[PDB]
Design an enzyme around this catalytic site. Sequence first.
Site, PDB file in Angstrom:
ATOM      1  N   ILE A  70      54.588  12.871  15.527  1.00  0.00           N
ATOM      2  CA  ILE A  70      55.055  11.486  15.357  1.00  0.00           C
ATOM      3  C   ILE A  70      53.874  10.553  15.668  1.00  0.00           C
ATOM      4  O   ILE A  70      53.249  10.677  16.715  1.00  0.00           O
ATOM      5  CB  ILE A  70      56.224  11.188  16.326  1.00  0.00           C
ATOM      6  CG1 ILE A  70      57.464  11.951  15.855  1.00  0.00           C
ATOM      7  CG2 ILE A  70      56.541   9.701  16.380  1.00  0.00           C
ATOM      8  CD1 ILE A  70      58.721  11.648  16.677  1.00  0.00           C
TER       9      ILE A  70
ATOM     10  N   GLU B  97      60.097  19.267  16.318  1.00  0.00           N
ATOM     11  CA  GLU B  97      60.356  20.653  16.721  1.00  0.00           C
ATOM     12  C   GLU B  97      61.478  21.308  15.901  1.00  0.00           C
ATOM     13  O   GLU B  97      61.376  22.481  15.537  1.00  0.00           O
ATOM     14  CB  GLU B  97      60.648  20.755  18.230  1.00  0.00           C
ATOM     15  CG  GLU B  97      59.560  20.088  19.134  1.00  0.00           C
ATOM     16  CD  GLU B  97      58.208  20.814  19.149  1.00  0.00           C
ATOM     17  OE1 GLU B  97      57.340  20.416  19.963  1.00  0.00           O
ATOM     18  OE2 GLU B  97      57.994  21.758  18.356  1.00  0.00           O
TER      19      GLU B  97
ATOM     20  N   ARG C 128      60.110  22.470  12.701  1.00  0.00           N
ATOM     21  CA  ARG C 128      59.307  23.679  12.843  1.00  0.00           C
ATOM     22  C   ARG C 128      60.072  24.968  13.120  1.00  0.00           C
ATOM     23  O   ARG C 128      59.559  26.054  12.809  1.00  0.00           O
ATOM     24  CB  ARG C 128      58.292  23.502  13.978  1.00  0.00           C
ATOM     25  CG  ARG C 128      57.263  22.448  13.725  1.00  0.00           C
ATOM     26  CD  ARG C 128      56.610  22.073  15.066  1.00  0.00           C
ATOM     27  NE  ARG C 128      55.670  20.968  14.904  1.00  0.00           N
ATOM     28  CZ  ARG C 128      55.281  20.190  15.907  1.00  0.00           C
ATOM     29  NH1 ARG C 128      55.774  20.394  17.112  1.00  0.00           N
ATOM     30  NH2 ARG C 128      54.425  19.202  15.710  1.00  0.00           N
TER      31      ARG C 128
HETATM   32  N1  LIG Z   1      51.885  12.550  18.460  1.00  0.00           N
HETATM   33  C1  LIG Z   1      52.632  13.686  18.706  1.00  0.00           C
HETATM   34  N2  LIG Z   1      53.853  14.013  18.092  1.00  0.00           N
HETATM   35  C2  LIG Z   1      54.559  15.143  18.378  1.00  0.00           C
HETATM   36  N3  LIG Z   1      54.180  16.078  19.290  1.00  0.00           N
HETATM   37  C3  LIG Z   1      52.986  15.773  19.892  1.00  0.00           C
HETATM   38  C4  LIG Z   1      52.148  14.626  19.670  1.00  0.00           C
HETATM   39  N4  LIG Z   1      50.976  14.612  20.448  1.00  0.00           N
HETATM   40  C5  LIG Z   1      51.173  15.766  21.126  1.00  0.00           C
HETATM   41  N5  LIG Z   1      52.350  16.503  20.862  1.00  0.00           N
HETATM   42  C6  LIG Z   1      52.788  17.807  21.499  1.00  0.00           C
HETATM   43  C7  LIG Z   1      52.527  19.080  20.512  1.00  0.00           C
HETATM   44  C8  LIG Z   1      52.323  20.306  21.536  1.00  0.00           C
HETATM   45  O1  LIG Z   1      53.539  20.836  22.178  1.00  0.00           O
HETATM   46  C9  LIG Z   1      51.497  19.520  22.703  1.00  0.00           C
HETATM   47  C10 LIG Z   1      49.996  19.729  22.375  1.00  0.00           C
HETATM   48  O2  LIG Z   1      49.547  18.453  21.925  1.00  0.00           O
HETATM   49  P1  LIG Z   1      47.982  18.150  21.682  1.00  0.00           P
HETATM   50  O3  LIG Z   1      47.818  16.952  22.538  1.00  0.00           O
HETATM   51  O4  LIG Z   1      47.765  17.846  20.198  1.00  0.00           O
HETATM   52  O5  LIG Z   1      47.148  19.344  22.136  1.00  0.00           O
HETATM   53  O6  LIG Z   1      51.865  18.085  22.571  1.00  0.00           O
END
Ligand SMILES: Nc1ncnc2c1ncn2[C@H]1C[C@H](O)[C@@H](COP(=O)(O)O)O1
Length: 248
Positions: free
Chosen positions: A72, A161, A164
Amino acid sequence: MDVSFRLSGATSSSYGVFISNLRKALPNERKLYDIPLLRSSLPGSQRYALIHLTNYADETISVAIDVTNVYIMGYRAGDTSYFFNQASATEAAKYVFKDAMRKVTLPYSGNYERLQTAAGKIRENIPLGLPALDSAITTLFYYNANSAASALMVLIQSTSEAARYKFIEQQIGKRVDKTFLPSLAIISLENSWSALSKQIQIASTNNGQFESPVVLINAQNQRVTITNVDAGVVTSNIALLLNRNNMA
Ligand SMILES: Nc1ncnc2c1ncn2[C@H]1C[C@H](O)[C@@H](COP(=O)(O)O)O1
């Protein structure tokens, strides 16, 4: 391509139609083991989809999602846009919700570690289900720094989620008039999406075997070590694959 979901009159099946529509809206050229493989790079004009959500009270918010990873980027409530404080969202802001009069940059990125710290709660203690998505829409429509992080985690889990994983879509959708706390199995699927996506792509070039195992949590809260594409999570649960070139 945009999609919508209305909480008023919502049913388990209408949530399923919504999540199926969301999955279809995400561009894909290839499939591996019949699972759509998301693109690694897309031009701005093709990179975002909008999800329009209306609550029981007829209040609507529009949610911008990056179609390459289902993240998002931010949302719009009337005349105000709100974006996560992360590189991809800053980029998204150049393409979506351009006409909003006021633009708020949230104090955090959408990563769960930052959101749970901000909400002062872990995912297992935040209710999910359709009535919880209703409340998250209300909470974000009437934005308040005190309540937003928790609502955003409900929103991410109910959209990103669920898209997915069939399991997550099914557990959230069956709660039409009640709410529930997500199990460790859900937390594990969320935590493991990138690794699973990675190993499934490797398996396609390695006779169905993963190069590295992925540890998931089952129905009995036991650690199970997944090693190949005949495991139930690959054959009947994961519904989208993060591209290997879009993992960081
Ligand atoms: N913007 C956005 N939307 C939905 N889920 C998110 C978002 N930013 C991070 N995440 C969730 C996805 C993974 O479970 C965890 C790793 O994010 P990362 O920080 O990319 O390693 O954070």
